[PDB]
Design a protein around this ligand. Structure first.
Ligand SMILES: CN1[C@@H]2CC[C@H]1C[C@H](OC(=O)[C@H](CO)c1ccccc1)C2
Ligand SMILES: [Ca+2]
Length: 119
């Protein structure tokens, strides 16, 4: 669920608050369209596409589905006690959190004008 995703990010990128990723580029956050603006935005596009896939699973609501995961000692793990939906969503979030940590953050790309720049 989104609370868990926030915590994955807080755990893989403790140097930056999480709100830093909540409205970035064309894909991080509410946004979902256009040319990704940089590598971090690409991490968000993959994440967004991963959620759209998970939504194909019956009753599967990625923002809301509570899954089972752990973050400690630098490692994030989706646990084996996850159903198909939980496992899929947990995987999307884990991959995105890892991606976020490896991607440069560009202050210029925070809170861009989606309507004009993401067609
Ligand atoms: C309800 N939340 C979603 C749609 C609008 C808001 C904020 C969104 O934020 C994100 O999509 C990013 C990137 O996945 C994110 C960053 C930090 C916490 C939660 C989500 C998801
Ligand atoms: Ca999005």
């Amino acid at each position: 669920n989104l609370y868990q995703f926030k915590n994955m990010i807080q755990c893989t990128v403790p140097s930056r608050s999480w709100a830093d990723f909540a409205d970035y580029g064309c894909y991080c956050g509410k946004g979902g369209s256009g040319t990704p603006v940089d590598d971090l935005d690409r991490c968000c596009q993959t994440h967004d596409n991963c959620y759209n896939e998970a939504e194909n699973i019956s009753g599967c609501r990625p923002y809301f589905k509570t899954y089972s995961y752990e973050c400690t000692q630098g490692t994030l793990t989706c646990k084996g006690d996850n159903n198909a939906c939980a496992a899929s969503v947990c995987d999307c979030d884990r991959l995105a959190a890892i991606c976020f940590a490896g991607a440069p953050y560009n202050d210029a790309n925070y809170n861009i004008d989606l309507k004009a720049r993401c067609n």
